[PDB]
Amino acid sequence: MSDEMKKVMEALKKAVELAKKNNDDEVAREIERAAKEIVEALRENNSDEMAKVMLALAKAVLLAAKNNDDEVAREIARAAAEIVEALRENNSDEMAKVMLALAKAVLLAAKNNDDEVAREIARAAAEIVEALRENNSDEMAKKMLELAKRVLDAAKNNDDETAREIARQAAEEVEAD
Ligand SMILES: [Ca+2]
Ligand SMILES: [Ca+2]
Ligand SMILES: [Ca+2]
Ligand SMILES: [Ca+2]
Ligand SMILES: [Ca+2]
Ligand SMILES: [Ca+2]
Ligand SMILES: [Ca+2]
Ligand SMILES: [Ca+2]
């Protein structure tokens, strides 16, 4: 774990404590779950690409806890934790590319301070992750990379309508597979 990561993690620990202080116990649980997943992912894997994804996710959770509604904050934290779970199952170079794109998208969404966009970007990321955990073949990962790139562009355009469309296409590609 890097020193920039150690700083973000200490901030996450503060975010959990603040959530508890405000009686937001379910938010606190989900932030803690994501943080714990990240720590275990880094304990077992010294890949720099891994470290990159984990830093982006940690920052996204922290910003969402600060910027977004409680219930949106929960969705970003859940998306982050599920992204890490997927990477711990398979961190091929293609899987890492998908997850880096999604981590960048949830970070930007959390940073843009729009609750509807943050919610839809997190959901699109979650649908793509779910698809890969059902089948994380090289072929499925390539398909999901193109969708993940579109989620990132949607976050960049603050485009909640397009985020929802990508989520539906990811769920239907699973069906096709
Ligand atoms: Ca209070
Ligand atoms: Ca609250
Ligand atoms: Ca409690
Ligand atoms: Ca590499
Ligand atoms: Ca806000
Ligand atoms: Ca693994
Ligand atoms: Ca809109
Ligand atoms: Ca259908």
Cα–Cα distance measured from residue 127 to residue 55, given in angstroms and rounded to the nearest whole number: 21
Cα–ligand 1 centroid distance for 11 (angstroms): 20
Q: Identify whether the C-beta of residue 93 lies closer than 8 Å to the C-beta of residue 143.
A: no
Cα–ligand 4 centroid distance for 49 (angstroms): 6
State the maximum Cα–Cα separation within the chain, in Å, rounded to a whole number.
46
Number of neighbouring beta carbons within 10 Å of residue 160: 21
Ligand number, closest to the Cα atom of 22: 1
Nearest Cα to Cα of residue 91 among 152, 36, 132: 132
Resolution of the solved structure (Å): 1.8
Cα–ligand 1 centroid distance for 99 (angstroms): 35
Q: Identify whether the C-beta of residue 41 lies closer than 8 Å to the C-beta of residue 54.
A: yes
Q: What is the H or E stretch that residue 145 is in?
A: helix 138-156
Q: Identify whether the C-beta of residue 66 lies closer than 8 Å to the C-beta of residue 20.
A: no
SS3 at position 94:
helix
Domain extents for the chain?
3-176
Helices of type H across 22-69: 25-44, 48-67
Helices of type H across 48-137: 48-67, 70-89, 93-111, 115-134
Q: Identify whether the C-beta of residue 63 lies closer than 8 Å to the C-beta of residue 109.
A: no
Cα–ligand 6 centroid distance for 115 (angstroms): 33
Ligand number, closest to the Cα atom of 50: 4
Cα–Cα distance measured from residue 105 to residue 28, given in angstroms and rounded to the nearest whole number: 22
What single letter denotes the amino acid at residue 72? V
